PDB file of all heavy atoms in Angstrom:
ATOM      1  N   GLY X 254     199.681  41.512 128.638  1.00 68.94           N
ATOM      2  CA  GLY X 254     199.483  42.934 128.815  1.00 68.94           C
ATOM      3  C   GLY X 254     199.911  43.677 127.572  1.00 68.94           C
ATOM      4  O   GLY X 254     200.734  44.592 127.631  1.00 68.94           O
ATOM      5  N   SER X 256     198.381  45.668 125.455  1.00 66.06           N
ATOM      6  CA  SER X 256     197.818  46.956 125.067  1.00 66.06           C
ATOM      7  C   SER X 256     198.562  48.143 125.671  1.00 66.06           C
ATOM      8  O   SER X 256     198.258  49.293 125.325  1.00 66.06           O
ATOM      9  CB  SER X 256     196.348  47.038 125.468  1.00 66.06           C
ATOM     10  OG  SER X 256     196.222  46.931 126.874  1.00 66.06           O
ATOM     11  N   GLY X 257     199.519  47.903 126.558  1.00 67.26           N
ATOM     12  CA  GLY X 257     200.201  48.977 127.244  1.00 67.26           C
ATOM     13  C   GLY X 257     201.266  49.667 126.397  1.00 67.26           C
ATOM     14  O   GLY X 257     201.581  49.272 125.274  1.00 67.26           O
ATOM     15  N   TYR X 258     201.839  50.722 126.990  1.00 65.84           N
ATOM     16  CA  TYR X 258     202.766  51.618 126.292  1.00 65.84           C
ATOM     17  C   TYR X 258     204.005  50.883 125.811  1.00 65.84           C
ATOM     18  O   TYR X 258     204.368  50.953 124.630  1.00 65.84           O
ATOM     19  CB  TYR X 258     203.146  52.759 127.239  1.00 65.84           C
ATOM     20  CG  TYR X 258     204.373  53.592 126.905  1.00 65.84           C
ATOM     21  CD1 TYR X 258     204.465  54.314 125.717  1.00 65.84           C
ATOM     22  CD2 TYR X 258     205.415  53.708 127.825  1.00 65.84           C
ATOM     23  CE1 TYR X 258     205.591  55.113 125.441  1.00 65.84           C
ATOM     24  CE2 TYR X 258     206.536  54.500 127.567  1.00 65.84           C
ATOM     25  CZ  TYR X 258     206.622  55.200 126.377  1.00 65.84           C
ATOM     26  OH  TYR X 258     207.747  55.983 126.135  1.00 65.84           O
ATOM     27  N   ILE X 259     204.668  50.175 126.719  1.00 65.42           N
ATOM     28  CA  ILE X 259     205.883  49.450 126.374  1.00 65.42           C
ATOM     29  C   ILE X 259     205.555  48.267 125.478  1.00 65.42           C
ATOM     30  O   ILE X 259     206.238  48.009 124.481  1.00 65.42           O
ATOM     31  CB  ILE X 259     206.603  48.987 127.652  1.00 65.42           C
ATOM     32  CG1 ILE X 259     207.158  50.189 128.416  1.00 65.42           C
ATOM     33  CG2 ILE X 259     207.732  48.015 127.312  1.00 65.42           C
ATOM     34  CD1 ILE X 259     207.682  49.825 129.817  1.00 65.42           C
ATOM     35  N   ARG X 279     192.716  42.878 128.168  1.00 60.50           N
ATOM     36  CA  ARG X 279     191.629  42.699 129.119  1.00 60.50           C
ATOM     37  C   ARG X 279     190.272  42.466 128.453  1.00 60.50           C
ATOM     38  O   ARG X 279     189.373  41.922 129.107  1.00 60.50           O
ATOM     39  CB  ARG X 279     191.543  43.919 130.036  1.00 60.50           C
ATOM     40  CG  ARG X 279     192.608  44.021 131.136  1.00 60.50           C
ATOM     41  CD  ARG X 279     192.022  44.883 132.262  1.00 60.50           C
ATOM     42  NE  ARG X 279     192.990  45.474 133.186  1.00 60.50           N
ATOM     43  CZ  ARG X 279     193.048  45.177 134.486  1.00 60.50           C
ATOM     44  NH1 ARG X 279     192.226  44.275 135.010  1.00 60.50           N
ATOM     45  NH2 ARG X 279     193.911  45.787 135.276  1.00 60.50           N
ATOM     46  N   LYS X 283     189.449  46.095 123.453  1.00 50.76           N
ATOM     47  CA  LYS X 283     190.821  46.525 123.220  1.00 50.76           C
ATOM     48  C   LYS X 283     191.496  45.690 122.143  1.00 50.76           C
ATOM     49  O   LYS X 283     192.292  46.221 121.364  1.00 50.76           O
ATOM     50  CB  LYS X 283     191.606  46.481 124.537  1.00 50.76           C
ATOM     51  CG  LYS X 283     191.096  47.514 125.535  1.00 50.76           C
ATOM     52  CD  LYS X 283     191.443  47.192 126.986  1.00 50.76           C
ATOM     53  CE  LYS X 283     191.546  48.480 127.817  1.00 50.76           C
ATOM     54  NZ  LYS X 283     191.549  48.231 129.274  1.00 50.76           N
ATOM     55  N   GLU X 303     191.894  39.724 133.906  1.00 41.15           N
ATOM     56  CA  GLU X 303     192.451  40.084 135.207  1.00 41.15           C
ATOM     57  C   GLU X 303     193.573  39.104 135.541  1.00 41.15           C
ATOM     58  O   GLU X 303     193.304  37.945 135.872  1.00 41.15           O
ATOM     59  CB  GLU X 303     191.344  40.066 136.262  1.00 41.15           C
ATOM     60  CG  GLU X 303     191.825  40.351 137.659  1.00 41.15           C
ATOM     61  CD  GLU X 303     192.648  41.623 137.697  1.00 41.15           C
ATOM     62  OE1 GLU X 303     192.045  42.710 137.559  1.00 41.15           O
ATOM     63  OE2 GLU X 303     193.892  41.517 137.840  1.00 41.15           O
ATOM     64  N   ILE X 304     194.827  39.561 135.465  1.00 40.49           N
ATOM     65  CA  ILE X 304     195.937  38.646 135.710  1.00 40.49           C
ATOM     66  C   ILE X 304     195.973  38.166 137.151  1.00 40.49           C
ATOM     67  O   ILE X 304     196.601  37.142 137.442  1.00 40.49           O
ATOM     68  CB  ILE X 304     197.296  39.278 135.338  1.00 40.49           C
ATOM     69  CG1 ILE X 304     197.618  40.476 136.242  1.00 40.49           C
ATOM     70  CG2 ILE X 304     197.338  39.649 133.850  1.00 40.49           C
ATOM     71  CD1 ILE X 304     198.904  41.259 135.777  1.00 40.49           C
ATOM     72  N   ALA X 327     204.822  40.883 130.465  1.00 34.96           N
ATOM     73  CA  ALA X 327     204.914  42.323 130.636  1.00 34.96           C
ATOM     74  C   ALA X 327     203.751  42.915 131.421  1.00 34.96           C
ATOM     75  O   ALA X 327     203.814  44.096 131.779  1.00 34.96           O
ATOM     76  CB  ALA X 327     205.024  43.015 129.265  1.00 34.96           C
ATOM     77  N   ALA X 328     202.719  42.128 131.727  1.00 32.71           N
ATOM     78  CA  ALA X 328     201.511  42.621 132.392  1.00 32.71           C
ATOM     79  C   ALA X 328     201.776  42.855 133.883  1.00 32.71           C
ATOM     80  O   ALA X 328     201.979  41.913 134.652  1.00 32.71           O
ATOM     81  CB  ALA X 328     200.365  41.636 132.180  1.00 32.71           C
ATOM     82  N   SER X 329     201.710  44.117 134.300  1.00 29.89           N
ATOM     83  CA  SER X 329     201.701  44.498 135.704  1.00 29.89           C
ATOM     84  C   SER X 329     201.215  45.934 135.757  1.00 29.89           C
ATOM     85  O   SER X 329     201.438  46.685 134.795  1.00 29.89           O
ATOM     86  CB  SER X 329     203.124  44.383 136.303  1.00 29.89           C
ATOM     87  OG  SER X 329     203.132  44.465 137.722  1.00 29.89           O
ATOM     88  N   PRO X 330     200.525  46.339 136.825  1.00 31.90           N
ATOM     89  CA  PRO X 330     199.870  47.659 136.815  1.00 31.90           C
ATOM     90  C   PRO X 330     200.848  48.766 137.179  1.00 31.90           C
ATOM     91  O   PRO X 330     201.574  48.666 138.171  1.00 31.90           O
ATOM     92  CB  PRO X 330     198.776  47.528 137.883  1.00 31.90           C
ATOM     93  CG  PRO X 330     199.284  46.442 138.808  1.00 31.90           C
ATOM     94  CD  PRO X 330     200.029  45.483 137.922  1.00 31.90           C
ATOM     95  N   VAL X 331     200.823  49.840 136.392  1.00 34.13           N
ATOM     96  CA  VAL X 331     201.572  51.057 136.683  1.00 34.13           C
ATOM     97  C   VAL X 331     200.554  52.154 136.950  1.00 34.13           C
ATOM     98  O   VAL X 331     200.115  52.844 136.026  1.00 34.13           O
ATOM     99  CB  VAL X 331     202.506  51.448 135.524  1.00 34.13           C
ATOM    100  CG1 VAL X 331     203.412  52.607 135.939  1.00 34.13           C
ATOM    101  CG2 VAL X 331     203.323  50.233 135.067  1.00 34.13           C
ATOM    102  N   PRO X 345     198.018  41.954 141.925  1.00 38.76           N
ATOM    103  CA  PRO X 345     198.121  41.655 140.483  1.00 38.76           C
ATOM    104  C   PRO X 345     199.549  41.410 140.030  1.00 38.76           C
ATOM    105  O   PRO X 345     199.785  40.502 139.224  1.00 38.76           O
ATOM    106  CB  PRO X 345     197.521  42.903 139.826  1.00 38.76           C
ATOM    107  CG  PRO X 345     196.682  43.528 140.893  1.00 38.76           C
ATOM    108  CD  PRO X 345     197.442  43.292 142.151  1.00 38.76           C
ATOM    109  N   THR X 371     209.181  41.635 132.417  1.00 30.51           N
ATOM    110  CA  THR X 371     209.425  43.053 132.677  1.00 30.51           C
ATOM    111  C   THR X 371     209.398  43.263 134.183  1.00 30.51           C
ATOM    112  O   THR X 371     208.328  43.346 134.792  1.00 30.51           O
ATOM    113  CB  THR X 371     208.385  43.941 131.992  1.00 30.51           C
ATOM    114  OG1 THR X 371     208.065  43.384 130.724  1.00 30.51           O
ATOM    115  CG2 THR X 371     208.943  45.353 131.777  1.00 30.51           C
ATOM    116  N   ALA X 372     210.575  43.320 134.805  1.00 29.12           N
ATOM    117  CA  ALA X 372     210.637  43.765 136.185  1.00 29.12           C
ATOM    118  C   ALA X 372     210.747  45.281 136.152  1.00 29.12           C
ATOM    119  O   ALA X 372     210.104  45.929 135.314  1.00 29.12           O
ATOM    120  CB  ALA X 372     211.805  43.100 136.934  1.00 29.12           C
ATOM    121  N   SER X 373     211.594  45.864 137.000  1.00 30.74           N
ATOM    122  CA  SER X 373     211.808  47.303 136.910  1.00 30.74           C
ATOM    123  C   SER X 373     213.116  47.662 137.590  1.00 30.74           C
ATOM    124  O   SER X 373     213.609  46.937 138.453  1.00 30.74           O
ATOM    125  CB  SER X 373     210.661  48.094 137.561  1.00 30.74           C
ATOM    126  OG  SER X 373     211.022  49.459 137.738  1.00 30.74           O
ATOM    127  N   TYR X 411     204.066  50.556 144.591  1.00 35.98           N
ATOM    128  CA  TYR X 411     204.307  50.093 143.229  1.00 35.98           C
ATOM    129  C   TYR X 411     205.678  49.447 143.113  1.00 35.98           C
ATOM    130  O   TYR X 411     205.820  48.378 142.511  1.00 35.98           O
ATOM    131  CB  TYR X 411     204.191  51.233 142.218  1.00 35.98           C
ATOM    132  CG  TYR X 411     204.846  50.846 140.896  1.00 35.98           C
ATOM    133  CD1 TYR X 411     204.185  50.020 139.987  1.00 35.98           C
ATOM    134  CD2 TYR X 411     206.130  51.288 140.568  1.00 35.98           C
ATOM    135  CE1 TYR X 411     204.775  49.635 138.792  1.00 35.98           C
ATOM    136  CE2 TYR X 411     206.743  50.905 139.350  1.00 35.98           C
ATOM    137  CZ  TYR X 411     206.048  50.077 138.479  1.00 35.98           C
ATOM    138  OH  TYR X 411     206.604  49.675 137.290  1.00 35.98           O
ATOM    139  N   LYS X 415     206.653  45.414 142.125  1.00 36.08           N
ATOM    140  CA  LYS X 415     207.678  44.987 141.178  1.00 36.08           C
ATOM    141  C   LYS X 415     208.674  44.049 141.856  1.00 36.08           C
ATOM    142  O   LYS X 415     209.004  42.979 141.325  1.00 36.08           O
ATOM    143  CB  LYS X 415     208.383  46.225 140.621  1.00 36.08           C
ATOM    144  CG  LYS X 415     207.559  47.081 139.654  1.00 36.08           C
ATOM    145  CD  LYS X 415     206.667  46.225 138.770  1.00 36.08           C
ATOM    146  CE  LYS X 415     207.504  45.767 137.570  1.00 36.08           C
ATOM    147  NZ  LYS X 415     206.750  45.060 136.495  1.00 36.08           N
ATOM    148  N   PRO X 442     213.714  48.382 133.431  1.00 50.05           N
ATOM    149  CA  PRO X 442     213.740  49.775 132.970  1.00 50.05           C
ATOM    150  C   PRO X 442     213.524  50.725 134.131  1.00 50.05           C
ATOM    151  O   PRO X 442     212.830  50.402 135.098  1.00 50.05           O
ATOM    152  CB  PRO X 442     212.571  49.850 131.976  1.00 50.05           C
ATOM    153  CG  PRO X 442     212.097  48.404 131.786  1.00 50.05           C
ATOM    154  CD  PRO X 442     212.465  47.701 133.059  1.00 50.05           C
ATOM    155  N   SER X 443     214.156  51.902 134.037  1.00 47.20           N
ATOM    156  CA  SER X 443     213.837  53.019 134.918  1.00 47.20           C
ATOM    157  C   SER X 443     212.650  53.764 134.307  1.00 47.20           C
ATOM    158  O   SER X 443     211.905  53.168 133.535  1.00 47.20           O
ATOM    159  CB  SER X 443     215.065  53.913 135.125  1.00 47.20           C
ATOM    160  OG  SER X 443     215.732  54.152 133.897  1.00 47.20           O
ATOM    161  N   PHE X 444     212.445  55.045 134.613  1.00 47.88           N
ATOM    162  CA  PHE X 444     211.275  55.734 134.064  1.00 47.88           C
ATOM    163  C   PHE X 444     211.335  55.756 132.538  1.00 47.88           C
ATOM    164  O   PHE X 444     212.302  56.252 131.959  1.00 47.88           O
ATOM    165  CB  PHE X 444     211.191  57.146 134.627  1.00 47.88           C
ATOM    166  CG  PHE X 444     210.516  57.213 135.969  1.00 47.88           C
ATOM    167  CD1 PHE X 444     211.216  56.913 137.124  1.00 47.88           C
ATOM    168  CD2 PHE X 444     209.169  57.518 136.062  1.00 47.88           C
ATOM    169  CE1 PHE X 444     210.591  56.961 138.359  1.00 47.88           C
ATOM    170  CE2 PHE X 444     208.538  57.564 137.288  1.00 47.88           C
ATOM    171  CZ  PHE X 444     209.249  57.288 138.440  1.00 47.88           C
ATOM    172  N   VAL X 445     210.301  55.218 131.885  1.00 49.32           N
ATOM    173  CA  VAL X 445     210.331  54.971 130.445  1.00 49.32           C
ATOM    174  C   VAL X 445     209.650  56.125 129.729  1.00 49.32           C
ATOM    175  O   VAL X 445     208.473  56.419 129.976  1.00 49.32           O
ATOM    176  CB  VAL X 445     209.670  53.628 130.085  1.00 49.32           C
ATOM    177  CG1 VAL X 445     209.777  53.392 128.577  1.00 49.32           C
ATOM    178  CG2 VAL X 445     210.393  52.496 130.791  1.00 49.32           C
ATOM    179  N   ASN X 460     199.930  57.150 129.378  1.00 68.47           N
ATOM    180  CA  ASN X 460     200.353  56.225 130.428  1.00 68.47           C
ATOM    181  C   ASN X 460     201.161  56.980 131.470  1.00 68.47           C
ATOM    182  O   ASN X 460     201.774  58.000 131.136  1.00 68.47           O
ATOM    183  CB  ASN X 460     201.189  55.089 129.845  1.00 68.47           C
ATOM    184  CG  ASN X 460     202.446  55.601 129.162  1.00 68.47           C
ATOM    185  OD1 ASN X 460     202.371  56.194 128.089  1.00 68.47           O
ATOM    186  ND2 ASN X 460     203.602  55.388 129.784  1.00 68.47           N
ATOM    187  N   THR X 462     204.086  57.092 133.046  1.00 68.64           N
ATOM    188  CA  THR X 462     205.419  57.687 132.990  1.00 68.64           C
ATOM    189  C   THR X 462     205.514  58.750 131.899  1.00 68.64           C
ATOM    190  O   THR X 462     206.128  59.798 132.117  1.00 68.64           O
ATOM    191  CB  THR X 462     206.517  56.615 132.847  1.00 68.64           C
ATOM    192  OG1 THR X 462     206.358  55.845 131.643  1.00 68.64           O
ATOM    193  CG2 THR X 462     206.505  55.699 134.083  1.00 68.64           C
TER     194      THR X 462
HETATM  195  N1  NAP T 685     206.747  52.880 132.184  1.00 41.86           N
HETATM  196  C1  NAP T 685     207.898  52.653 133.037  1.00 41.86           C
HETATM  197  O1  NAP T 685     208.577  53.574 133.371  1.00 41.86           O
HETATM  198  C2  NAP T 685     208.251  51.242 133.523  1.00 41.86           C
HETATM  199  C3  NAP T 685     209.424  51.062 134.195  1.00 41.86           C
HETATM  200  C4  NAP T 685     209.773  49.821 134.650  1.00 41.86           C
HETATM  201  C5  NAP T 685     208.915  48.750 134.418  1.00 41.86           C
HETATM  202  N2  NAP T 685     207.744  48.921 133.750  1.00 41.86           N
HETATM  203  C6  NAP T 685     206.878  47.761 133.565  1.00 41.86           C
HETATM  204  O2  NAP T 685     206.468  47.589 132.033  1.00 41.86           O
HETATM  205  C7  NAP T 685     205.302  46.968 131.998  1.00 41.86           C
HETATM  206  C8  NAP T 685     204.295  47.861 131.221  1.00 41.86           C
HETATM  207  O3  NAP T 685     204.298  49.136 131.796  1.00 41.86           O
HETATM  208  P1  NAP T 685     203.734  50.426 130.952  1.00 41.86           P
HETATM  209  O4  NAP T 685     204.516  51.669 131.315  1.00 41.86           O
HETATM  210  O5  NAP T 685     203.727  50.141 129.462  1.00 41.86           O
HETATM  211  O6  NAP T 685     202.244  50.673 131.583  1.00 41.86           O
HETATM  212  P2  NAP T 685     200.829  50.540 130.817  1.00 41.86           P
HETATM  213  O7  NAP T 685     200.782  51.405 129.587  1.00 41.86           O
HETATM  214  O8  NAP T 685     199.821  50.956 131.854  1.00 41.86           O
HETATM  215  O9  NAP T 685     200.672  48.956 130.400  1.00 41.86           O
HETATM  216  C9  NAP T 685     200.343  48.042 131.418  1.00 41.86           C
HETATM  217  C10 NAP T 685     199.800  46.755 130.728  1.00 41.86           C
HETATM  218  O10 NAP T 685     199.557  45.806 131.620  1.00 41.86           O
HETATM  219  C11 NAP T 685     197.983  45.546 131.645  1.00 41.86           C
HETATM  220  N3  NAP T 685     197.658  45.334 133.027  1.00 41.86           N
HETATM  221  C12 NAP T 685     198.056  45.943 134.151  1.00 41.86           C
HETATM  222  N4  NAP T 685     197.458  45.348 135.180  1.00 41.86           N
HETATM  223  C13 NAP T 685     196.689  44.360 134.690  1.00 41.86           C
HETATM  224  C14 NAP T 685     195.858  43.449 135.319  1.00 41.86           C
HETATM  225  N5  NAP T 685     195.621  43.367 136.750  1.00 41.86           N
HETATM  226  N6  NAP T 685     195.193  42.545 134.610  1.00 41.86           N
HETATM  227  C15 NAP T 685     195.333  42.518 133.256  1.00 41.86           C
HETATM  228  N7  NAP T 685     196.138  43.420 132.634  1.00 41.86           N
HETATM  229  C16 NAP T 685     196.814  44.339 133.356  1.00 41.86           C
HETATM  230  C17 NAP T 685     197.510  46.703 131.218  1.00 41.86           C
HETATM  231  O11 NAP T 685     196.172  46.542 130.611  1.00 41.86           O
HETATM  232  P3  NAP T 685     194.964  47.596 130.969  1.00 41.86           P
HETATM  233  O12 NAP T 685     195.390  48.937 130.487  1.00 41.86           O
HETATM  234  O13 NAP T 685     193.769  47.085 130.194  1.00 41.86           O
HETATM  235  O14 NAP T 685     194.690  47.633 132.451  1.00 41.86           O
HETATM  236  C18 NAP T 685     198.464  47.115 130.082  1.00 41.86           C
HETATM  237  O15 NAP T 685     198.257  46.371 128.952  1.00 41.86           O
HETATM  238  C19 NAP T 685     204.853  46.781 133.461  1.00 41.86           C
HETATM  239  O16 NAP T 685     205.180  45.523 133.890  1.00 41.86           O
HETATM  240  C20 NAP T 685     205.701  47.854 134.174  1.00 41.86           C
HETATM  241  O17 NAP T 685     205.714  47.556 135.638  1.00 41.86           O
HETATM  242  C21 NAP T 685     207.397  50.157 133.303  1.00 41.86           C
END
Side-chain angles (χ1 to χ4, degrees):
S256 62
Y258 163 60
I259 292 170
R279 284 205 200 244
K283 293 158 152 166
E303 177 52 72
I304 65 187
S329 193
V331 188
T371 322
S373 167
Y411 163 79
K415 289 324 275 188
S443 44
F444 276 81
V445 182
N460 60 288
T462 61

